[PDB]
Design a protein around this ligand. Structure first.
Ligand code: CNC
Ligand SMILES: [Ca+2]
Ligand SMILES: [Ca+2]
Lengths: 394, 80, 123
């Protein structure tokens, strides 16, 4: 059977795109987002001339900062910039282009070395970014060594334990699919074929009784991967229809606010995936997006990990973000937090002067010990909620 | 129209970084960038020395289809 | 979430101990873990929500049979063909998150039972 997720109401799709639209005018390097560009080009929606300026800003920022600036794009972000080039039917080229390719290849080589031949060692970033990097290079027809593919081939088998991420498995699966379709790494062809099936099975086993693969926010990338190949023996069609039901309910309940999440979902709603960047169709018609023309809440903020420990009740207007609660806590006094830019949005580097170290992140949780599925800007707490910030080791 | 730090592409008028004015890379649409023109650090094992450059590259980057050496020496004879 | 184990006492090798764990509420992944006395804890088997979302540690494969009643929030381990090493305390565990296969490690499970000890006799 095939994974077919049928078209959602054009109105519903349009309002998703309108969430992306304001970002088209935010061209500062801290806000530039190659995933937004890609998601829009693969969608049934367009922003017209704004897109061209956006791509121009991407090429200015990424090439100047990496090869020559407020900040620098990470290597993972460079990979998504490569996807953005494919979305405009471009191959990375010229002397600058060649250098960018080798920088991404160095990223993969360093992660390979960090992982080790024992395979005990962890990557400095994630297996998600490792897969994303292989995919990005493959989309531009740039080859990577079998030894590099093998790390990912291992990371995908159920009991491996490098990660337990439906997103990472889907991205891998996407990387493996590009290798297979391009006939790259022929000395790993059978293992690559088997790994794709492995990822299929593990994703179909992460399905929630509601219908989602892992989490509402894992479902988009999971669907992208599942759409790329048949799955004989399995009931892929049924699983995917159940996922649309779950997806539809989530959409109608305002689950998708975050621009990156929308950018990963929009291709699915247009029957496209990142694998369509092998043979892009840049001139396919797309609908022009036009701009879419009081209660008081108390949220408890608790940071047990820090000594002295922090528990406080913060009063904010309803619909306020966790970041909004954090900002009020700084004004009232006794709270300091630090944030770093991400394509997803603000990321919490520090709470109360403690900044997470290697393999440490500040988890956002709502009692009792339930990890939040959304970021500090995206999540809006219900009244009487306790929001906790815990330093945890990944 | 253009800051001293940035070269001005002719016709487009677009301001691109001054580096790239003569990078052998045609960065402006017209090409106005290029046409107007003009004791040692040891490597790891499992790396090559580029034939003419300082540079070291994983030995698997030999004949991988992509020039990783400035001299392109990693992609020269390239036959079994 | 509360997990309450049941069954499991004093069997001769070769076996047939059934085991049970019931939970107050619906959970994502439910699994079983055995602790040898004095030796940390070991993963035994998972079972997520759908069909054969069954994961087994290589020690128990072929005895095995983790099963899950989603209606009644209750998992089970058939544990046929028992041996010396199977003597241990068996703990039920649960987590509200369904992940990408094989959670295996502790720490990935938030809710635990008190355990049923199982003991196998050599004679
Ligand atoms: C890798 C991983 C993943 N994560 Co995290 C997970 N698990 N994440 C991160 C690591 C990240 C650390 C690393 N060195 O990579 C990790 C585990 C510590 C982080 C932490 C969590 N993650 C978060 C979830 C919720 C998000 N993460 C995803 C982006 C989820 C991703 C899945 C996905 N679908 O994208 C994910 C697989 C891949 C991230 C990536 O590399 N993108 C590629 C990269 C090129 O883009 P980037 O933006 O430059 O990547 C950076 C950011 O992703 C940032 N980051 C990671 N997660 C978040 C979440 C938010 C809300 C924000 C603003 C930034 C991040 O860390 C990266 C820098 O390394 C997200 C889709 C995962 C998911 N399916 O649940 C989820 C967002 C859902 C949404 N509505 O947007 C947490 C909030 C969980 C929690 N309750 O704490 C938390 C972020 C807390 C905070 N301090 O602000
Ligand atoms: Ca040039
Ligand atoms: Ca090469």
């Amino acid at each position: 059977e095939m994974c077919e997720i049928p078209e959602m109401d054009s109105h519903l799709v349009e309002k998703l795109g309108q969430h992306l639209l304001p970002w088209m005018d935010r061209l500062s390097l801290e806000h530039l987002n190659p995933s937004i560009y890609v998601g829009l080009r693969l969608s049934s929606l367009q922003a017209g001339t704004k897109e061209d300026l956006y791509l121009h800003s991407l090429k200015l920022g990424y090439q100047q900062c990496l090869l020559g600036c407020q900040g620098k794009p990470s290597m993972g972000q460079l990979a998504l910039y490569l996807l953005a080039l494919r979305a405009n039917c471009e191959f990375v080229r010229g002397h600058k282009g060649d250098r960018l390719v080798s920088q991404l290849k160095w990223f993969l080589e360093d992660e390979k070395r960090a992982i080790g031949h024992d395979h005990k060692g962890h990557p400095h970033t994630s297996y998600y970014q490792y897969g994303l990097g292989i995919l990005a290079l493959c989309l531009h027809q740039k080859r990577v060594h079998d030894s590099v593919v093998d790390k990912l081939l291992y990371a995908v088998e159920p009991f491996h334990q490098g990660h337990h991420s439906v997103d990472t498995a889907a991205m891998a699966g996407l990387a493996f699919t590009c290798l297979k379709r391009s006939n790259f790494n022929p000395g790993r062809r059978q293992r690559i074929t088997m790994a794709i099936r492995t990822v299929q099975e593990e994703i179909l086993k992460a399905q929630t009784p509601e219908g989602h693969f892992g989490n509402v926010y894992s479902t988009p990338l999971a669907l992208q991967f599942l759409m790329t190949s048949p799955m004989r023996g399995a009931e892929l069609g049924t699983a995917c229809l159940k996922a649309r039901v779950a997806l539809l309910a989530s959409l109608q309940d305002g689950a998708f606010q975050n621009a990156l999440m929308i950018s990963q979902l929009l291709p699915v709603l247009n029957h496209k995936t990142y694998i369509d960047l092998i043979f892009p169709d840049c001139l396919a018609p797309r609908v022009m997006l036009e701009p879419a023309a009081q209660e008081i809440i108390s949220v408890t903020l608790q940071v047990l990990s820090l000594l002295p420990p922090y528990r406080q009740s913060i009063s904010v207007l309803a619909g306020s973000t966790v970041e909004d609660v954090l900002k009020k806590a700084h004004e009232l006094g006794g709270f300091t937090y630090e944030t770093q830019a991400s394509l997803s949005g603000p990321y919490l580097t520090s709470v109360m002067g403690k900044a997470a170290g290697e393999r440490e992140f500040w988890q956002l949780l709502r009692d009792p010990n339930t990890p939040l599925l959304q970021g500090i800007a995206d999540y809006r707490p219900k009244d009487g909620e306790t929001i906790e910030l815990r330093l945890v080791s990944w | 129209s253009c800051p001293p730090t940035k070269f001005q592409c002719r016709t487009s008028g677009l301001c691109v970084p001054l580096t790239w004015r003569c990078d052998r890379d045609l960065d402006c649409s017209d090409g106005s960038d290029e046409e107007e023109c003009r004791s040692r650090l040891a490597c790891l094992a499992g790396e090559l020395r580029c034939t003419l450059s300082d540079d070291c590259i994983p030995l698997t980057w030999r004949c991988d289809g992509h020039p990783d050496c400035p001299d392109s020496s990693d992609e020269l004879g390239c036959g079994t | 979430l509360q997990l309450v184990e049941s069954g499991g006492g004093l069997v001769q090798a070769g076996g047939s101990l059934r085991l049970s764990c019931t939970a107050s509420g619906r959970t994502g992944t439910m699994g079983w873990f055995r602790q040898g006395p004095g030796k940390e804890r070991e993963f035994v088997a998972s079972h997520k929500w759908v069909a054969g979302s069954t994961y087994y540690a290589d020690s128990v494969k072929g005895r095995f049979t983790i099963s899950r009643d989603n209606a009644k929030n209750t998992l089970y381990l058939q544990m046929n063909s028992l041996k010396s090493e199977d003597t241990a305390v068996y703990y039920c565990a649960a987590s509200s998150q369904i992940f990408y296969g094989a959670t295996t490690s502790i720490k990935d499970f938030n809710s635990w039972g008190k355990g049923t000890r199982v003991t196998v006799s050599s004679h």
